[PDB]
Design an enzyme around this catalytic site. Structure first.
Site, PDB file in Angstrom:
ATOM      1  N   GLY A 123      25.554  53.925  15.528  1.00  0.00           N
ATOM      2  CA  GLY A 123      24.299  53.785  16.372  1.00  0.00           C
ATOM      3  C   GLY A 123      23.133  54.501  15.605  1.00  0.00           C
ATOM      4  O   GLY A 123      23.619  55.411  15.131  1.00  0.00           O
ATOM      5  N   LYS A 124      22.005  54.108  15.767  1.00  0.00           N
ATOM      6  CA  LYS A 124      21.052  54.752  15.161  1.00  0.00           C
ATOM      7  C   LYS A 124      19.665  55.020  16.140  1.00  0.00           C
ATOM      8  O   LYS A 124      19.372  53.872  16.511  1.00  0.00           O
ATOM      9  CB  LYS A 124      20.423  53.976  13.926  1.00  0.00           C
ATOM     10  CG  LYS A 124      19.387  54.284  13.255  1.00  0.00           C
ATOM     11  CD  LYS A 124      18.897  53.546  12.196  1.00  0.00           C
ATOM     12  CE  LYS A 124      17.809  54.142  11.192  1.00  0.00           C
ATOM     13  NZ  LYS A 124      17.625  52.994   9.942  1.00  0.00           N
ATOM     14  N   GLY A 125      19.051  55.965  16.296  1.00  0.00           N
ATOM     15  CA  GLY A 125      18.199  56.244  17.146  1.00  0.00           C
ATOM     16  C   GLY A 125      17.101  57.261  16.413  1.00  0.00           C
ATOM     17  O   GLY A 125      17.170  57.641  15.397  1.00  0.00           O
ATOM     18  N   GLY A 126      16.042  57.428  17.201  1.00  0.00           N
ATOM     19  CA  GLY A 126      15.080  58.340  16.954  1.00  0.00           C
ATOM     20  C   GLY A 126      15.481  59.841  16.434  1.00  0.00           C
ATOM     21  O   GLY A 126      14.866  60.493  15.774  1.00  0.00           O
ATOM     22  N   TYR A 127      16.627  60.265  17.143  1.00  0.00           N
ATOM     23  CA  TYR A 127      16.949  61.407  16.835  1.00  0.00           C
ATOM     24  C   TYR A 127      18.252  61.747  16.326  1.00  0.00           C
ATOM     25  O   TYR A 127      18.575  63.067  15.952  1.00  0.00           O
ATOM     26  CB  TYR A 127      17.211  62.246  18.379  1.00  0.00           C
ATOM     27  CG  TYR A 127      16.129  62.601  19.297  1.00  0.00           C
ATOM     28  CD1 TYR A 127      15.293  63.659  19.159  1.00  0.00           C
ATOM     29  CD2 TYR A 127      15.908  61.847  20.425  1.00  0.00           C
ATOM     30  CE1 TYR A 127      14.231  63.682  19.893  1.00  0.00           C
ATOM     31  CE2 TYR A 127      14.875  62.061  21.274  1.00  0.00           C
ATOM     32  CZ  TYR A 127      13.919  62.921  20.940  1.00  0.00           C
ATOM     33  OH  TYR A 127      12.652  63.211  21.837  1.00  0.00           O
ATOM     34  N   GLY A 128      18.631  60.629  15.525  1.00  0.00           N
ATOM     35  CA  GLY A 128      19.999  60.803  14.921  1.00  0.00           C
ATOM     36  C   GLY A 128      20.792  59.512  14.744  1.00  0.00           C
ATOM     37  O   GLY A 128      20.251  58.634  15.087  1.00  0.00           O
ATOM     38  N   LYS A 129      21.940  59.710  14.612  1.00  0.00           N
ATOM     39  CA  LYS A 129      22.825  58.896  14.282  1.00  0.00           C
ATOM     40  C   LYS A 129      24.462  58.792  14.592  1.00  0.00           C
ATOM     41  O   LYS A 129      24.786  60.004  14.687  1.00  0.00           O
ATOM     42  CB  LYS A 129      22.873  58.323  12.629  1.00  0.00           C
ATOM     43  CG  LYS A 129      21.832  57.400  12.023  1.00  0.00           C
ATOM     44  CD  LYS A 129      21.997  57.380  10.546  1.00  0.00           C
ATOM     45  CE  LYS A 129      21.552  55.884  10.151  1.00  0.00           C
ATOM     46  NZ  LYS A 129      21.217  55.743   8.746  1.00  0.00           N
ATOM     47  N   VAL A 130      24.846  57.899  15.064  1.00  0.00           N
ATOM     48  CA  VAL A 130      26.425  58.021  15.326  1.00  0.00           C
ATOM     49  C   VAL A 130      27.088  57.319  14.356  1.00  0.00           C
ATOM     50  O   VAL A 130      26.929  56.147  13.949  1.00  0.00           O
ATOM     51  CB  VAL A 130      26.724  57.668  16.818  1.00  0.00           C
ATOM     52  CG1 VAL A 130      28.210  57.611  16.898  1.00  0.00           C
ATOM     53  CG2 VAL A 130      26.083  58.353  17.766  1.00  0.00           C
TER      54      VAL A 130
ATOM     55  N   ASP B 103      22.453  57.285  34.827  1.00  0.00           N
ATOM     56  CA  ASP B 103      22.136  55.926  34.547  1.00  0.00           C
ATOM     57  C   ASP B 103      23.691  55.406  34.274  1.00  0.00           C
ATOM     58  O   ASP B 103      24.244  55.808  33.066  1.00  0.00           O
ATOM     59  CB  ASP B 103      21.132  55.535  33.134  1.00  0.00           C
ATOM     60  CG  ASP B 103      20.950  54.356  32.828  1.00  0.00           C
ATOM     61  OD1 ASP B 103      20.899  53.379  33.474  1.00  0.00           O
ATOM     62  OD2 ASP B 103      19.859  54.297  31.936  1.00  0.00           O
TER      63      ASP B 103
ATOM     64  N   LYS C 159      23.925  51.866  33.215  1.00  0.00           N
ATOM     65  CA  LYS C 159      23.820  50.590  32.677  1.00  0.00           C
ATOM     66  C   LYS C 159      24.944  50.312  31.887  1.00  0.00           C
ATOM     67  O   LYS C 159      25.638  51.445  31.416  1.00  0.00           O
ATOM     68  CB  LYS C 159      22.491  50.588  31.783  1.00  0.00           C
ATOM     69  CG  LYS C 159      22.319  51.632  30.763  1.00  0.00           C
ATOM     70  CD  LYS C 159      21.145  51.466  29.878  1.00  0.00           C
ATOM     71  CE  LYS C 159      20.992  52.431  28.992  1.00  0.00           C
ATOM     72  NZ  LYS C 159      19.672  52.066  28.084  1.00  0.00           N
TER      73      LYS C 159
ATOM     74  N   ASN D 135      26.041  52.106  28.757  1.00  0.00           N
ATOM     75  CA  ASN D 135      26.355  53.565  28.865  1.00  0.00           C
ATOM     76  C   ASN D 135      27.873  53.877  29.187  1.00  0.00           C
ATOM     77  O   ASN D 135      28.085  54.979  29.497  1.00  0.00           O
ATOM     78  CB  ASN D 135      25.425  54.391  30.154  1.00  0.00           C
ATOM     79  CG  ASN D 135      23.992  54.591  29.190  1.00  0.00           C
ATOM     80  OD1 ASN D 135      23.895  54.294  28.179  1.00  0.00           O
ATOM     81  ND2 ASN D 135      23.156  54.781  30.228  1.00  0.00           N
TER      82      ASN D 135
HETATM   83  C1  LIG Z   1      29.538  59.050  20.728  1.00  0.00           C
HETATM   84  C2  LIG Z   1      30.831  58.271  21.452  1.00  0.00           C
HETATM   85  C3  LIG Z   1      31.351  57.178  20.889  1.00  0.00           C
HETATM   86  C4  LIG Z   1      32.683  57.178  20.674  1.00  0.00           C
HETATM   87  N1  LIG Z   1      33.258  56.213  19.897  1.00  0.00           N
HETATM   88  C5  LIG Z   1      32.438  55.048  19.639  1.00  0.00           C
HETATM   89  N2  LIG Z   1      31.357  54.992  19.848  1.00  0.00           N
HETATM   90  C6  LIG Z   1      30.726  56.006  20.403  1.00  0.00           C
HETATM   91  N3  LIG Z   1      29.140  55.770  20.759  1.00  0.00           N
HETATM   92  C7  LIG Z   1      28.569  55.822  22.016  1.00  0.00           C
HETATM   93  C8  LIG Z   1      27.223  56.076  22.041  1.00  0.00           C
HETATM   94  N4  LIG Z   1      26.596  55.003  21.306  1.00  0.00           N
HETATM   95  C9  LIG Z   1      25.136  54.477  21.599  1.00  0.00           C
HETATM   96  C10 LIG Z   1      24.321  55.532  20.996  1.00  0.00           C
HETATM   97  N5  LIG Z   1      24.026  56.844  21.170  1.00  0.00           N
HETATM   98  C11 LIG Z   1      23.164  57.444  20.153  1.00  0.00           C
HETATM   99  C12 LIG Z   1      22.729  58.714  20.224  1.00  0.00           C
HETATM  100  C13 LIG Z   1      21.695  58.750  19.054  1.00  0.00           C
HETATM  101  C14 LIG Z   1      21.089  60.138  18.776  1.00  0.00           C
HETATM  102  F1  LIG Z   1      21.765  60.776  17.849  1.00  0.00           F
HETATM  103  F2  LIG Z   1      21.333  61.144  19.929  1.00  0.00           F
HETATM  104  F3  LIG Z   1      19.674  60.163  18.592  1.00  0.00           F
HETATM  105  C15 LIG Z   1      21.644  57.966  18.056  1.00  0.00           C
HETATM  106  C16 LIG Z   1      22.446  56.656  18.287  1.00  0.00           C
HETATM  107  C17 LIG Z   1      23.101  56.225  19.522  1.00  0.00           C
HETATM  108  N6  LIG Z   1      23.685  55.169  19.852  1.00  0.00           N
HETATM  109  C18 LIG Z   1      26.921  54.674  20.087  1.00  0.00           C
HETATM  110  C19 LIG Z   1      28.536  54.851  19.996  1.00  0.00           C
END
Ligand SMILES: CCc1cncnc1N1CCN(Cc2nc3cc(C(F)(F)F)ccc3[nH]2)CC1
Ligand SMILES: [Zn+2]
Length: 291
Positions: free
Chosen positions: A14-21, A134, A136, A139
């Site tokens: 995942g990729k967002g304004g505050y960072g990445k996962v 939330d 949704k 989440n």
């Molecule tokens: C971390 C737990 C998890 C465990 N295993 C697999 N997947 C997971 N995540 C669950 C959360 N998910 C949605 C998500 N949260 C994010 C928070 C950010 C932030 F850096 F906060 F900005 C950026 C992109 C994000 N995308 C991506 C996959």
């Protein structure tokens, strides 16, 4: 001594304004070879904003003190000058959202399973003073066996934001309680509304109050004129009616009984809460078997 160099990046989750996962593999120590999820936050942006800072510390503290089978586990946390790192267990089952979009609508015993697991997670957070807010479907993740994991405790994951004081309207607001949208103050009753909205989505294919635009969607939620589908069992309909109420204090779960009060509802009568918590109940979908 855990450092960024102890992990190999595998891919972006995942990729967002505050960072990445990222999905990562640990390449040092006794957990060598082990796979984790790694959240990397951009420090410079967060530190400037005082409430962004507070909320970041809050997520750390939350996951540090929470320990429950239906909530994501935090393994390590560390920092450099530029980045904040959270190493969480890797959840290979995907988002609950994917199952719903696959299936269109869930059968009632499918819905019952997920909602029951979620209710135990909420009961645990509520005992700790924590409000999820939330529910949704994006989440909520599934582990490798197909069991529920709540994961959303941190900063807004969105790439663009609504306003500059709260992160309430950045994602969909379709599963949020009227009192959250009105910013009139709220408590854990907000989670039982949201469970009702999730349930309604599972059993009918869409959240209960949707409009063509946001302003109309908000108005629909505040009005709270619920349409109960006639084809649902009387048990499902009775529970939805008791969750999706505008008067927060009068929702099932709002009183002292909290989760135990919701778990006592006839909709959940086939659930053995001991087996469920022990994760002995077979999930309706096995992500491992999913082509
Ligand atoms: C971390 C737990 C998890 C465990 N295993 C697999 N997947 C997971 N995540 C669950 C959360 N998910 C949605 C998500 N949260 C994010 C928070 C950010 C932030 F850096 F906060 F900005 C950026 C992109 C994000 N995308 C991506 C996959
Ligand atoms: Zn936001």
């Amino acid at each position: 001594k855990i450092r960024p160099e102890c992990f190999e990046l595998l891919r972006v989750l995942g990729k967002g304004g505050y960072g990445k996962v990222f999905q990562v593999r640990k390449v040092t120590g006794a957990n060598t070879g082990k796979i984790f999820a790694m959240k990397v936050l951009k420090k410079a942006m967060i530190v400037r904003n005082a409430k962004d800072t507070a909320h970041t510390k809050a997520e750390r503290n939350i996951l540090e003190e929470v320990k429950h089978p239906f909530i994501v586990d935090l393994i390590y946390a560390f920092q450099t000058g530029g980045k904040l790192y959270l190493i969480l267990e890797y959840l290979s089952g995907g988002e609950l959202f994917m199952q719903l979009e696959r299936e269109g609508i869930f059968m009632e015993d499918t819905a019952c399973f997920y909602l029951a697991e979620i209710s135990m997670a909420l009961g645990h957070l509520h005992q700790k003073g924590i409000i999820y807010r939330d529910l949704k479907p994006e989440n909520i993740m599934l582990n490798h066996q197909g069991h529920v994991k709540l994961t959303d405790f941190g900063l807004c994951k969105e790439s663009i934001h609504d306003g500059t004081v709260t992160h309430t309207f950045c994602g969909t607001i379709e599963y949020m309680a009227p009192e959250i949208l009105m910013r009139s103050g709220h408590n854990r009753a907000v989670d039982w509304w949201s469970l009702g909205a999730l349930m309604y989505d599972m059993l009918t294919g869409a959240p209960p109050f949707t409009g063509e635009n946001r302003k109309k969607t908000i108005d629909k939620i505040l009005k709270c004129k619920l349409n109960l589908p006639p084809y649902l069992t009387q048990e499902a309909r009775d529970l939805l009616k008791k969750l999706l109420k505008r008067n927060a204090a009068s929702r099932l779960g709002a009183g002292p009984g909290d989760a135990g009060e919701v778990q006592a509802h006839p909709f959940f009568r086939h659930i053995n809460w001991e087996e469920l918590l022990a994760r002995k109940v077979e999930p309706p979908f096995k992500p491992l078997l999913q082509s």
